[PDB]
Design a binder for this molecule. Structure first.
Ligand SMILES: [Zn+2]
Length: 37
């Protein structure tokens, strides 16, 4: 797991989750489901 991707929410309905020093990106839009690292 290498944290180095712009996971910042893409659209307005995106949402970022905070995890063990890591982060996530869930959203209604499937193209926005990402993960920090
Ligand atoms: Zn989104």
């Amino acid at each position: 797991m290498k944290v180095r991707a712009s996971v910042k929410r893409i659209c307005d309905k995106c949402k970022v989750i905070r995890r063990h020093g890591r982060v996530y990106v869930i959203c209604e839009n499937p193209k926005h489901k990402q993960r920090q690292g």
